[PDB]
Each structure stands twice: as C-alpha cells, then as structure tokens.
Design an enzyme around this catalytic site. Structure first.
Site, PDB file in Angstrom:
ATOM      1  N   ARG A  53       1.432  62.516   1.358  1.00 52.13           N
ATOM      2  CA  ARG A  53       2.403  61.491   0.853  1.00 52.13           C
ATOM      3  C   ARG A  53       3.609  61.491   1.757  1.00 52.13           C
ATOM      4  NH1 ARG A  53       4.133  60.857  -3.915  1.00 52.13           N
ATOM      5  NH2 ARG A  53       4.421  62.878  -4.838  1.00 52.13           N
ATOM      6  N   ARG A  80       7.400  62.422  11.466  1.00 54.32           N
ATOM      7  CA  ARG A  80       7.817  61.862  12.712  1.00 54.32           C
ATOM      8  C   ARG A  80       8.095  62.457  14.083  1.00 54.32           C
ATOM      9  NH1 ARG A  80      11.235  59.261   8.443  1.00 54.32           N
ATOM     10  NH2 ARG A  80       9.466  58.693   6.693  1.00 54.32           N
ATOM     11  N   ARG A  89       0.993  70.397 -13.469  1.00 56.23           N
ATOM     12  CA  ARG A  89       2.078  71.033 -13.495  1.00 56.23           C
ATOM     13  C   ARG A  89       3.360  70.505 -14.285  1.00 56.23           C
ATOM     14  NH1 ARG A  89       4.000  75.697 -11.476  1.00 56.23           N
ATOM     15  NH2 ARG A  89       2.598  76.552  -9.966  1.00 56.23           N
ATOM     16  N   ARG A 147      14.342  71.990  -6.287  1.00 56.54           N
ATOM     17  CA  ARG A 147      15.440  71.165  -5.702  1.00 56.54           C
ATOM     18  C   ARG A 147      16.684  70.852  -6.697  1.00 56.54           C
ATOM     19  NH1 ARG A 147      11.701  65.801  -5.537  1.00 56.54           N
ATOM     20  NH2 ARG A 147      11.050  65.530  -7.833  1.00 56.54           N
ATOM     21  N   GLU A 162      15.739  71.822 -10.844  1.00 58.62           N
ATOM     22  CA  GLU A 162      14.710  71.534 -11.125  1.00 58.62           C
ATOM     23  C   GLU A 162      13.778  72.684 -11.035  1.00 58.62           C
ATOM     24  OE1 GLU A 162      12.984  67.468  -9.462  1.00 58.62           O
ATOM     25  OE2 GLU A 162      11.125  68.925  -8.723  1.00 58.62           O
ATOM     26  N   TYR A 173      -1.883  60.707  -9.321  1.00 57.31           N
ATOM     27  CA  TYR A 173      -0.531  60.379  -9.017  1.00 57.31           C
ATOM     28  C   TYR A 173      -0.175  58.938  -8.630  1.00 57.31           C
ATOM     29  CZ  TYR A 173       4.223  60.701  -7.394  1.00 57.31           C
ATOM     30  OH  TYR A 173       5.653  60.494  -7.221  1.00 57.31           O
ATOM     31  N   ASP A 208       2.732  56.137  -7.879  1.00 60.55           N
ATOM     32  CA  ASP A 208       3.911  55.666  -7.778  1.00 60.55           C
ATOM     33  C   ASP A 208       4.413  54.330  -8.619  1.00 60.55           C
ATOM     34  OD1 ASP A 208       4.816  57.400  -5.767  1.00 60.55           O
ATOM     35  OD2 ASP A 208       3.991  56.156  -4.193  1.00 60.55           O
TER      36      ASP A 208
HETATM   37  C1  LIG Z   1       8.998  64.376 -11.187  1.00 63.46           C
HETATM   38  C2  LIG Z   1       8.490  62.692 -10.871  1.00 63.46           C
HETATM   39  C3  LIG Z   1       9.147  62.008  -9.903  1.00 63.46           C
HETATM   40  C4  LIG Z   1       8.915  60.628  -9.611  1.00 63.46           C
HETATM   41  C5  LIG Z   1       7.902  60.204 -10.317  1.00 63.46           C
HETATM   42  C6  LIG Z   1       7.055  60.924 -11.051  1.00 63.46           C
HETATM   43  C7  LIG Z   1       7.251  62.287 -11.310  1.00 63.46           C
HETATM   44  C8  LIG Z   1       6.375  63.126 -12.184  1.00 63.46           C
HETATM   45  N1  LIG Z   1       7.184  58.850 -10.035  1.00 63.46           N
HETATM   46  C9  LIG Z   1       6.036  58.273 -10.598  1.00 63.46           C
HETATM   47  C10 LIG Z   1       6.385  57.314 -11.693  1.00 63.46           C
HETATM   48  O1  LIG Z   1       7.192  57.974 -12.636  1.00 63.46           O
HETATM   49  C11 LIG Z   1       5.329  56.775 -12.313  1.00 63.46           C
HETATM   50  O2  LIG Z   1       4.584  55.781 -11.590  1.00 63.46           O
HETATM   51  C12 LIG Z   1       5.292  55.918 -13.560  1.00 63.46           C
HETATM   52  O3  LIG Z   1       5.934  56.807 -14.345  1.00 63.46           O
HETATM   53  C13 LIG Z   1       4.100  55.625 -14.416  1.00 63.46           C
HETATM   54  O4  LIG Z   1       4.518  54.780 -15.361  1.00 63.46           O
HETATM   55  P1  LIG Z   1       3.301  54.753 -16.643  1.00 63.46           P
HETATM   56  O5  LIG Z   1       3.698  53.654 -17.602  1.00 63.46           O
HETATM   57  O6  LIG Z   1       2.039  54.289 -16.047  1.00 63.46           O
HETATM   58  O7  LIG Z   1       3.333  56.137 -17.162  1.00 63.46           O
HETATM   59  P2  LIG Z   1       4.534  56.819 -18.106  1.00 63.46           P
HETATM   60  O8  LIG Z   1       4.036  58.034 -18.000  1.00 63.46           O
HETATM   61  O9  LIG Z   1       6.189  56.578 -17.470  1.00 63.46           O
HETATM   62  O10 LIG Z   1       4.434  56.302 -19.411  1.00 63.46           O
HETATM   63  C14 LIG Z   1       3.485  56.638 -20.284  1.00 63.46           C
HETATM   64  C15 LIG Z   1       4.195  56.337 -21.670  1.00 63.46           C
HETATM   65  O11 LIG Z   1       3.062  56.297 -22.912  1.00 63.46           O
HETATM   66  C16 LIG Z   1       3.640  57.235 -24.068  1.00 63.46           C
HETATM   67  N2  LIG Z   1       2.703  57.843 -24.615  1.00 63.46           N
HETATM   68  C17 LIG Z   1       1.688  58.886 -23.840  1.00 63.46           C
HETATM   69  N3  LIG Z   1       0.929  59.328 -24.892  1.00 63.46           N
HETATM   70  C18 LIG Z   1       1.095  58.515 -26.172  1.00 63.46           C
HETATM   71  C19 LIG Z   1       0.378  58.682 -27.256  1.00 63.46           C
HETATM   72  N4  LIG Z   1      -0.666  59.342 -27.465  1.00 63.46           N
HETATM   73  N5  LIG Z   1       0.896  57.845 -28.275  1.00 63.46           N
HETATM   74  C20 LIG Z   1       2.098  57.017 -28.040  1.00 63.46           C
HETATM   75  N6  LIG Z   1       2.630  57.135 -26.853  1.00 63.46           N
HETATM   76  C21 LIG Z   1       2.053  57.768 -25.862  1.00 63.46           C
HETATM   77  C22 LIG Z   1       4.774  58.252 -23.105  1.00 63.46           C
HETATM   78  O12 LIG Z   1       5.554  58.344 -24.202  1.00 63.46           O
HETATM   79  C23 LIG Z   1       5.455  57.379 -22.317  1.00 63.46           C
HETATM   80  O13 LIG Z   1       6.454  56.732 -22.706  1.00 63.46           O
HETATM   81  C24 LIG Z   1       7.904  58.114  -8.978  1.00 63.46           C
HETATM   82  N7  LIG Z   1       7.433  56.958  -8.474  1.00 63.46           N
HETATM   83  C25 LIG Z   1       8.178  56.231  -7.528  1.00 63.46           C
HETATM   84  O14 LIG Z   1       7.582  55.111  -7.249  1.00 63.46           O
HETATM   85  N8  LIG Z   1       9.307  56.772  -6.953  1.00 63.46           N
HETATM   86  C26 LIG Z   1       9.783  58.012  -7.353  1.00 63.46           C
HETATM   87  O15 LIG Z   1      10.776  58.468  -6.943  1.00 63.46           O
HETATM   88  C27 LIG Z   1       9.264  58.653  -8.436  1.00 63.46           C
HETATM   89  N9  LIG Z   1       9.571  59.821  -8.716  1.00 63.46           N
HETATM   90  O1  LIG Z   2      10.258  70.110   0.666  1.00 64.80           O
HETATM   91  C1  LIG Z   2       9.293  69.847   0.323  1.00 64.80           C
HETATM   92  C2  LIG Z   2       8.642  69.042  -0.235  1.00 64.80           C
HETATM   93  C3  LIG Z   2       7.410  68.773  -0.641  1.00 64.80           C
HETATM   94  N1  LIG Z   2       6.536  69.487  -0.066  1.00 64.80           N
HETATM   95  C4  LIG Z   2       5.180  69.419  -0.501  1.00 64.80           C
HETATM   96  O2  LIG Z   2       4.700  67.959  -0.517  1.00 64.80           O
HETATM   97  C5  LIG Z   2       4.860  67.257  -1.694  1.00 64.80           C
HETATM   98  C6  LIG Z   2       5.949  66.061  -1.832  1.00 64.80           C
HETATM   99  O3  LIG Z   2       5.455  65.192  -3.059  1.00 64.80           O
HETATM  100  P1  LIG Z   2       6.877  64.523  -3.537  1.00 64.80           P
HETATM  101  O4  LIG Z   2       8.097  64.615  -2.963  1.00 64.80           O
HETATM  102  O5  LIG Z   2       6.543  62.952  -3.725  1.00 64.80           O
HETATM  103  O6  LIG Z   2       6.895  65.005  -5.020  1.00 64.80           O
HETATM  104  P2  LIG Z   2       7.809  64.348  -6.145  1.00 64.80           P
HETATM  105  O7  LIG Z   2       6.758  63.506  -7.035  1.00 64.80           O
HETATM  106  O8  LIG Z   2       8.409  65.491  -7.056  1.00 64.80           O
HETATM  107  O9  LIG Z   2       8.893  63.453  -5.573  1.00 64.80           O
HETATM  108  C7  LIG Z   2       9.506  62.193  -6.427  1.00 64.80           C
HETATM  109  O10 LIG Z   2      10.942  62.269  -6.193  1.00 64.80           O
HETATM  110  C8  LIG Z   2      11.525  62.037  -4.715  1.00 64.80           C
HETATM  111  C9  LIG Z   2      13.019  62.005  -5.025  1.00 64.80           C
HETATM  112  O11 LIG Z   2      13.343  62.208  -3.434  1.00 64.80           O
HETATM  113  C10 LIG Z   2      10.969  60.850  -4.084  1.00 64.80           C
HETATM  114  O12 LIG Z   2      11.392  59.512  -5.006  1.00 64.80           O
HETATM  115  C11 LIG Z   2       9.272  61.130  -4.287  1.00 64.80           C
HETATM  116  O13 LIG Z   2       8.861  59.603  -3.686  1.00 64.80           O
HETATM  117  C12 LIG Z   2       8.968  61.038  -5.624  1.00 64.80           C
HETATM  118  O14 LIG Z   2       7.327  61.099  -5.755  1.00 64.80           O
HETATM  119  C13 LIG Z   2       5.365  68.411  -2.721  1.00 64.80           C
HETATM  120  O15 LIG Z   2       4.758  68.452  -4.027  1.00 64.80           O
HETATM  121  C14 LIG Z   2       4.707  69.533  -1.805  1.00 64.80           C
HETATM  122  O16 LIG Z   2       3.472  69.668  -2.111  1.00 64.80           O
HETATM  123  C15 LIG Z   2       6.876  70.780   0.502  1.00 64.80           C
HETATM  124  O17 LIG Z   2       6.106  71.757   0.723  1.00 64.80           O
HETATM  125  N2  LIG Z   2       8.226  70.919   0.776  1.00 64.80           N
END
Ligand SMILES: Cc1cc2c(cc1C)N(C[C@H](O)[C@H](O)[C@H](O)COP(=O)(O)OP(=O)(O)OC[C@H]1O[C@@H](n3cnc4c(N)ncnc43)[C@H](O)[C@@H]1O)c1[nH]c(=O)[nH]c(=O)c1N2
Ligand SMILES: O=c1ccn([C@@H]2O[C@H](COP(=O)(O)OP(=O)(O)O[C@H]3O[C@H](CO)[C@H](O)[C@H](O)[C@H]3O)[C@@H](O)[C@H]2O)c(=O)[nH]1
Ligand SMILES: Cc1cc2c(cc1C)N(C[C@H](O)[C@H](O)[C@H](O)COP(=O)(O)OP(=O)(O)OC[C@H]1O[C@@H](n3cnc4c(N)ncnc43)[C@H](O)[C@@H]1O)c1[nH]c(=O)[nH]c(=O)c1N2
Ligand SMILES: O=c1ccn([C@@H]2O[C@H](COP(=O)(O)OP(=O)(O)O)[C@@H](O)[C@H]2O)c(=O)[nH]1
Lengths: 374, 383
Positions: A164, A168, A240, A270, A291, A339, A341
C-alpha cells in the site's frame, strides 16, 4: 413502490447507501451500536484544546476516482492536504515512505535516482526484503514495525499489505500517489451528518442489530463484521486491534501529524498530533495519541484484518453461508473482511446502491455481494 | 470615448493593464521587442523531450491575494504544486528552508520542536540588538554552523559580495521553522498553470480591442500617436542609458538533457561556494501531472549583469539608488506616460504582486478619465 430498507452501521457504507436509496424514495432505517455516527471515520473537537481529534486514528482522504471526489465535495469543503510521514529510528529522523532522501540520509550518500538504483541492487541479494532492499535497510524501517504491527515474525510470508506504500527514487515524500487528497474542513463527522441529512432517513444510535428484525424489511444492508452476523459459529476471523493513549501538550509536541517509531523496543507504533491535520486552524494546546497494536479479542474494536492462510479458509466458510441468504447484502471492510480506504468504501457503496435500484427496476434478485470476495 | 493606448511589453504588466482597458472600450496596441509573448514568465516546450521549460528561470505562482488568484484562475487551470527545495552540501542532501528535519539531520539529534528552539537559541548570538547585515542576521538567529553550511557560500555566489556587505532584509524573509513543514512558501494560494504561463498570458491577451506586434522595439516618436503609453521596459534604457546602467545580477542557464530522472526534484541548491552553479533545476518536476522520459535540466550561474545580458536581480544599493534617482527626476517630467513593472521601476516583483499592480494601474487610469485629471507617471512608490 418504496421499499423498507434496514442499514446496519452509520459509517460511510451505511450512510452513502442510505442516502442513494432515500433519494429515490425508499424508506431508510439506519442503526448503529455506537453512541455517535461515522463509524471509524468519526472525529470530534476535544473540549479543552478544541482540536479536531480523529478518534479512531489518523484519517486522510485520497483517491484517483473523480466521481467519489466530486461526491464528497457536495457534502463538505475539502481543504488541500498532503500526508507526510516521519519516522524515528536509530537516533535519526527520516521521511517516509522510503524515497531518495531516506536512502541518501540513511547511507550518508549524495546519490542521484539512477545511482540509488545501482546502490540498492547491490545491497539487496522477510524474503521480498533481503533480495530487493538489503540487510541494513530491512532491519531499520521494516522488521521492527511489522513485528509491532502484525504481531508475528517477519519470518512469516510477506508479499502483501506493505505494498500500500510506494518505494520512490525521487524526492517525492507524499504517502500517497493518488491524484486527489484533502481533509474535510469541518471534519468527517459533519460530512457524514450531511450525507445522512434527508427526510427519508431515520437514524437510531445505541441500537444493536438483531436477526429478529430482518422480517420487517424488504432488504438489509449489513456493514458489521461477517463472522458476528453468524454468531461466530465457525470461529472468529483474525483482526489486529489498537489502543490509543491520549494526552495533552501545550505547544507543538512533535512537529508533524504522524511520527512512526520503527524500533521494536519502543512500545507504541506511532504518535499522531491531531492539530497537524488542520493546518488552516491554529491551536495552542495539542491533543496527541500514542498508538499500540495488539491481537483483537472479543471486547476490542477490530482494526486491520490479518488475512493470513488460516483466516482465508475460515472466511470462505462464512462466504458460502452468506451465499444462501435472500434479502441481505453484506458491504464494507467488516462485512467483507477487507482493508478498505474511505474512497474505495464510498465507491463501493454508490455501486451497491445502483445495483439495488437496478434490481427493483428490472425485477431481478439483489446479489448478497456487489464486489468480488471469493 | 475610446482611447488610443500603447503598451510596451507583453509580460504580465502589459497583458493585464491592456486587458482591463480593452474591457472598457479602448484601442490597445501592445508591442514587444522579443519574438514571443510572456516577458520573463515565458515557457515553451522543448523539441526533443516535450518538457515545458520555464525559459527565464523557474516560475512558481504564490499569493495571499484571493482577487489575483481568482483572476488567473479565469485564464488557466491552476494545478496544485508545492515547491519543496533540496540542498546539497557537505556530502549530504537536506531539505530547505531550514526546518526541524534539517536541524535534526545537520546536528544528528532527534529534537522535538521545543528542544530545537532551545538548541538554536544557544547557537545564536542574542547579544546582537538589531542585525543590520545578512551576516549579523544569520549569527543572531541560526548560528555560525548553519550559516556557513547553507547561506554563506550560496549568498556569495548569488550576489558577488560577502554577506557582511549585504542587507539583513534578504535573509529576514526566511525564518527558521521549528516543525516539519518543508513547503518553500508560506502563501495560502500556490500552484502552476497546466498549460503554462504563455497560454495563460495568451488568454489574457485574447480580447477584441487588442493587437499585439512582436519583434518590435519601442521608438520615442510613437508617443504622439497615443492618448497614453504604459511602459514596462527598463527605465534607464528609455532614457538611452545616458547616466549609466542600473546594476543587476544576471543568470546563465546551461541546458542539458538526461534520459531519465536526473535529480528527482524540481530544484536542488548547491550551497558550497566551491560548486560554481547556485543550483540545478529539472523542469519536468514543475509538471508532476505529466510524464516524460527525457529531462531537460539547467545549471544556473549568477554573475554581474553586463551591457548585453538579461537583467534578472536588481542590486539596489546606495550607488544604484543614486543612479535611479537621476532617472526618476526626469521621468517625473514626462506628460502622457506611465512606467510600470520590475524593469520600469527597478524592483523585484513576484507574479502575483505584478498582476495586482497592473490592476491598480488600469483602475487609476480609468478613474482619471472620468475625472479629467492627469494620470501620474508611477502608480506605486519609488523614491
Ligand atoms: C487505524 C485506521 C486508520 C485509517 C483507516 C482505518 C484504520 C483501521 N481508514 C479506513 C477507513 O476507516 C474505512 O474505510 C472506513 O471506516 C470504512 O467505513 P465503513 O462504513 O464501511 O465501516 P465502519 O467500520 O466505519 O462502520 C461500521 C459501523 O457499523 C456499526 N456496526 C458494526 N456492527 C454492528 C452491529 N452488529 N449492530 C449495529 N451496528 C454495528 C459500527 O458501530 C460502525 O459504526 C482510513 N481510510 C482512508 O481512506 N484514509 C485513512 O487515513 C484511513 N485511516
Ligand atoms: O513505518 C512503517 C509503516 C508501515 N509499515 C508496514 O506497512 C503498513 C502500512 O499500512 P498503513 O500505513 O496504511 O496502516 P494504517 O491503516 O494504520 O494507516 C492509516 O493511517 C495513515 C495516517 O498517516 C494513513 O492515512 C493511511 O493511509 C491509513 O491507512 C503497516 O501496516 C506495516 O505492515 C512498516 O513496516 N513501517
Ligand atoms: C530569476 C527569476 C525567477 C523568477 C522571477 C524573476 C526572476 C528574475 N519572478 C518574477 C516575475 O518574472 C515577474 O513578476 C514578471 O516577469 C513581471 O513581468 P513584467 O511584465 O512586469 O516585466 P517582464 O520583464 O516580464 O516583461 C517586460 C517585457 O518588456 C519587453 N520590452 C522591454 N523593453 C522593450 C522595448 N523597449 N520595446 C519593446 N518591448 C520591450 C521585454 O521584451 C519583456 O517581454 C517570479 N515571480 C513569481 O511570482 N514566482 C517565481 O517563481 C518567479 N521566478
Ligand atoms: O540555499 C540557499 C537559499 C537562499 N539563500 C539566501 O537567501 C536569499 C533568498 O533566496 P530565495 O531563493 O529564497 O528567494 P528569491 O531568490 O526568489 O528572492 C538568496 O539570495 C540567498 O542569499 C541562501 O543563502 N542559501
């Protein structure tokens, strides 16, 4: 005929499907178990400092899909933003993703792009790693973070999920390649609140989905986890999870939005300084998050799906159960074990809504999935 | 009534003034002595590589002026572009302008912002009340080490003078940053026109009442045919250089082509006094939304501007200002003319500033027709 539609979840999948069908006259009920909207996109102003906090981790919007971009710009004011991630390791600070500055700084070189390629080829020769990228580099930014992030050794097959990030040989340090990138001015919660704002959408919070509900609706869109919908009858899919130690600093604590820590001997993965996602605002006090990555256990929030061999076989059993259902469609990261976005989620929700609306006009049955999962 | 108007030059000053007037009925005649439009903002595509080249130096658009930003958005598609300059010195590559990353790399630390303030405060000499020279400014705020590494050699190359001879103002415009932002410009609006500045100026020039004649020098006998002349050529040249030439630094742009990515960024500064060019520019990175396999590159050298060189940077010290006064004193005695622009007024001026002044200058000359008053020779301060 307007259909009665139940939607489980009020994040992007729920919200956007809900709005598409509400607009065509359907009667939409959206529920969510949490006390607020937005799923994991949700954000909110901390009260003390007034910094917009990204409650479930840094969220940056990015896409090459111009339809989705236009779509969100109708619901928010997108502010230009570029994600520039820093990393601290071996008593030095580096830019990520690994670009020509990292290479030069790390090896103390003044290589050009091509000279860098020649340098890396000879240093190369866990397994993707040592061939391509070399010993010294492998250990520094990748071994330790992996271990901390996924929780298994780097000696357990890579070749997906770290791809992902781009790699570069130029000085571009933008974490993404995508054409469009920004940050909603008033945050993702208001953008979702605006998507939900339609007379045919009723939202209830603190409301758990119950199978007994299904029969009061013409169709159900389910964006909660696929294993839970089935009582976890074959086991729990591997996820995770994350803990966020919040704190407040009067100042600028680190100088960027996201600093990664690549050494394993540092507990957190981080630190993120939330006000740096709002450059157009000024704040004296700073909200910050250490985190920590763990194994997900039945009480935790599921964050990243593991999708090693085992979880795939287990997933396939739930897929084949879901394939025999009738008035339900499973969607989103949790519904399909992927996973995703925000941009891809929004793209998939619009398509799902279109296929459904098409299914009613052509009198055909609605699929259980609208995307590939098998 | 429609007025007869001669505009000397077809860069931003000419174009903008001359468009505002064609919009109010006037018969605008715009001449330029070069065989193309654009003044020093002119870009053009290279034959072999198809890279859009900024022929008189990289040109990056930046402003806090929403009005100007709107205006050029009417005449081009502005792509987002953030200038991120690198620097090669002492066998390493750094990011500029000085920020938390440069500091942590240079001194081998992993300081936070507040720890970097404390580090640089100990290096600086707070005993200097009011830095007057470039050197004093640097010793006051960044310290001997950073000064000598990033500024001394560079400044000497660029200006042909020791930094103790140069004004503090030059460096004042670049405060050290104590975070990780490496955008070169603090401005709110910032970018690059998609089809380049020529197409942009062509658009400004594309009105009913405007005729453009290229490869045509100004001749003093033309005055009589017009209600008013807007002049953005060099002020000393208008007066035949009769008192001497205003002082300028010039630049040699030394072209070469590479098959691939030669440096990997638009701009790379060489801060050592012992590398002869101030920098190398690789023009395709100014068009990151495009793809090119071959690259046009330039090494830039700074030297005193001589009789036949193109003037780029005004020196503006006492002697040059003395000289300027001599030409001002007789420009003040002219009747139906207005000197404008960087050359007309001996100032350095960015694009956004130049455009704002041209809007003001056109406003002022219309304001002065409705009031049958005299249009002054300058619409900006110069004394
Ligand atoms: C740590 C981290 C960081 C990022 C991101 C993910 C993660 C894990 N994302 C991904 C992004 O968060 C993701 O695409 C969206 O949350 C997806 O939204 P959804 O609506 O599909 O699920 P989402 O998980 O948001 O919504 C699910 C909803 O349904 C509800 N629900 C679940 N089970 C239920 C039940 N049985 N009964 C009633 N309600 C229930 C939950 O409460 C939740 O509110 C991201 N993407 C990106 O483009 N840029 C980014 O920087 C990031 N950063
Ligand atoms: O410093 C790093 C970073 C990442 N990884 C590996 O590469 C992956 C990178 O994945 P992501 O950064 O996308 O993991 P996150 O989902 O937690 O990051 C989220 O939060 C970030 C905020 O900077 C961005 O918005 C990113 O697009 C969004 O997915 C990691 O899981 C790990 O497998 C490393 O080994 N070292
Ligand atoms: C090295 C360098 C780099 C930059 C910049 C300057 C320099 C020197 N600029 C500044 C920018 O170039 C400046 O704002 C504009 O060129 C101003 O244009 P004018 O039309 O006012 O004069 P400009 O000099 O462009 O045009 C004057 C015109 O008059 C013509 N002319 C002169 N005498 C004549 C005669 N007697 N008869 C007929 N024609 C005559 C000339 O041929 C020329 O076309 C810049 N700004 C910015 O905002 N961002 C940037 O990155 C840069 N970069
Ligand atoms: O690596 C650098 C960059 C700039 N400068 C000094 O800062 C001044 C301002 O330079 P800049 O390129 O930022 O702005 P511009 O040249 O367009 O006015 C230069 O003349 C130099 O004296 C320097 O010493 N080293």
């Amino acid at each position: 005929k307007s259909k009665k539609i139940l939607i489980v979840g009020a994040g992007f999948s729920g919200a956007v499907i809900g709005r598409q069908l509400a607009e065509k006259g359907h009667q939409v009920h959206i529920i969510d178990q949490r006390d607020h909207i937005g799923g994991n996109s949700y954000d909110a102003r901390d009260s003390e400092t007034n910094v917009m906090v990204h409650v479930y981790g840094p969220h940056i919007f990015h896409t090459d899909n111009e339809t989705v971009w236009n779509y969100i710009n109708k619901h928010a004011e997108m502010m230009p933003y570029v994600n520039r991630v820093k990393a601290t390791v071996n008593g030095q600070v580096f830019s990520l993703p690994i670009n020509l500055h990292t290479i030069n700084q790390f090896f103390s070189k003044t290589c050009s792009p091509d000279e860098a390629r020649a340098l890396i080829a000879e240093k190369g020769d866990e397994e993707q790693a040592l061939r391509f990228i070399g010993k010294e580099l492998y250990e520094a930014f990748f071994k330790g973070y992996t271990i901390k992030q996924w929780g298994m050794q780097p000696s357990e097959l890579p070749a997906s999920i770290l791809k992902r990030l781009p790699v570069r040989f130029n000085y571009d340090d933008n974490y993404f390649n995508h054409k469009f990138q920004g940050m909603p001015k008033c945050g993702y919660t208001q953008m979702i609140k605006s998507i939900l704002n339609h007379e045919n959408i009723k939202v209830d919070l603190q409301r758990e989905f119950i199978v007994d509900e299904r029969t009061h609706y013409d169709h159900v869109f389910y964006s909660g986890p696929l294993d839970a919908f089935y009582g976890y009858q074959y086991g729990r899919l591997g996820y995770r999870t994350l803990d966020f130690k919040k704190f407040i600093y009067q100042g600028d604590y680190q100088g960027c939005a996201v600093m990664n820590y690549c050494s394993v001997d540092v507990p957190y993965t981080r630190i993120t300084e939330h006000k740096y996602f709002s450059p157009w605002e000024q704040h004296d006090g700073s909200v910050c998050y250490k985190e920590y990555s763990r194994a997900c256990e039945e009480n935790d929030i599921p964050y990243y799906p593991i999708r090693q061999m085992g979880e795939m076989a287990l997933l396939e059993k739930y897929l084949s159960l879901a394939e025999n259902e009738t008035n339900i469609t499973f969607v989103g990261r949790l519904g399909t074990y992927r996973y995703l976005d925000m941009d891809v989620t929004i793209a998939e929700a619009l398509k799902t809504a279109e296929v459904y609306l098409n299914s009613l006009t052509d009198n055909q049955p609605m699929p259980v999935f609208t995307v590939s999962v098998g």
